[PDB]
Amino acid sequence: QIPYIIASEACERFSFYGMRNILTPFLMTALLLSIPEELRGAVAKDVFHSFVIGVYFFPLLGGWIADRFFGKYNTILWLSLIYCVGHAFLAIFEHSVQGFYTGLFLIALGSGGIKPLVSSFMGDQFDQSNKSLAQKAFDMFYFTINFGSFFASLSMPLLLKNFGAAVAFGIPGVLMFVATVFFWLGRKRYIHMPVEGKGNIGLVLALIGGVSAAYALVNIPTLGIVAGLCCAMVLVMGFVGAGASLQLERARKSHPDAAVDGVRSVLRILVLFALVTPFWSLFDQKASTWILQANDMVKPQWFEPAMMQALNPLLVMLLIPFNNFVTALRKMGAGIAITGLSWIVVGTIQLMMDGGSALSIFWQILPYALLTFGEVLVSATGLEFAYSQAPKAMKGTIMSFWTLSVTVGNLWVLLANVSVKSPTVTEQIVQTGMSVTAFQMFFFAGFAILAAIVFA
After folding, report:
1. What residue ranges are annotated as transmembrane (predicted)?
2. How far apart are the C-alpha atoms of 286 and 308, rounded to whole Å?
3. Coil, helix or strand for 283?
4. What is the DSSP annotation of 306-369?
5. How many beta carbons lie within 10 A of that of residue 247, not counting itself?
């Protein structure tokens, strides 16, 4: 017996995608302090993208507890009773300032820290017949991700219009008590596996540790509750990522070679992955700004703005045999080039809503399907590039950084509604050539092309 994994995994996806979906419309429907639709969006992204940060930020504090401190089954149980607690906080504290974020805070750690746990765990539940069952695992987990979005459109958005908005956030939380039930029932099958020469060259490296320590203080006056915390992290790990790629290379005193030489090479390849970050700013944002364009668009009383969002990843399930007919480095080089055009394609159609404004349903399907091809070129290749880097045992850098690039891409989304919102002089210049809304539909479109150049 091993299927208890997917039985529970099935219930996480509606609890996460039926959450991620509802996030933006609920900000627009349940907020007072938020003034116009211009100041209802730069508040929807401010508190929602700060939640997607936390979901991809927590995987660090997930394993840190799961390997150094607690076990695996104890982590997944303890975190789920924090995941469902997060949901329970939502439906109960529906109309609350503190109550709602304090809720989203527990989803951020409850979900975030759990995904790097469940993923490793499956392959562990089989060592005897550790062969053909390995193929089943990745496929049954990926048939959950596709089925996850299905529930988020045909039965989840309708829970706010045709049903009360409270029980709408209440339903995923009921599905979580089901996930815990699958583990209390899964309690059987469980496994755990936890000199003037030296004084002149050496002072050059140590000082860059004070250079990186200076960036974190600049975040205190920013008044960034979230942005300031994530910026302090990115700036430190950024000026140690490429900065300390020579700092420890110079002061290497009796540490392995050929093994660390085939691993220290991976750390500079990690920077080539940090260039695939503006894709996550256009795929975790499809759940925010993409739903904003649909609101002004003339949509019917059944095809609500939330459906279109949770209907497009269902195109990947049919995209599989098409990739067989249509060179690893070249495959991922096209992923960044796709989002450059796929974003600007609607960056023109958005200004037509201020003029013509028509179709809506079919005039949102085509520009969304454009990302769906580049969606396959990043997810299926971003993981398999661990083979070409050659670290093998050194795994606690592959997942912990490729997935923590999702958490950096969302700081660039958070940047857009701060630098192109708060200053008066900056606002006077941006509104000259184009509009406030379409400038983001230009800035983000252009940034995906800026990355394809650095890629080389």
Report:
1. 14-35, 47-66, 73-93, 99-118, 166-185, 201-218, 224-246, 266-283, 310-326, 331-353, 365-387, 399-418, 438-456
2. 10
3. coil
4. HHHHTTSGGGHHHHGGGTTT---HHHHHTHHHHHHHHHHTTTTTTTTTTTT----SHHHHHHHH
5. 15
Spatial contact of 237 and 366, defined as CB atoms under 8 Å apart = no
DSSP 154-220: HTSTHHHHTS-HHHHHHHHHHHHHHHHHHHHSSSSS------TTHHHHHHHHHTHHHHHHHHTGGGT
User: Hey, what amino acid is at 186?
Assistant: G
Task: List CB contacts of 47: < 8 A, sequence separation 6 or more.
Answer: 27, 101, 104
Q: What is the resolution of this structure in A?
A: 3.6
Kindly calculate the radius of gyration of the chain based on its CA atoms and give it in whole angstroms.
23
- Determined by X-ray
Q: Which two tokens stand for residue 95?
A: 């109309």
Q: Name the helix (H) or strand (E) containing 292.
A: helix 289-296
What's the length of the chain? Answer: 456
* Both structure tokens of 175: 């599905």
Per the CB < 8 A criterion, the answer to whether 230 and 407 are in contact is yes
Nearest Cα to 407, choosing from 217, 234, 212, 148? 234
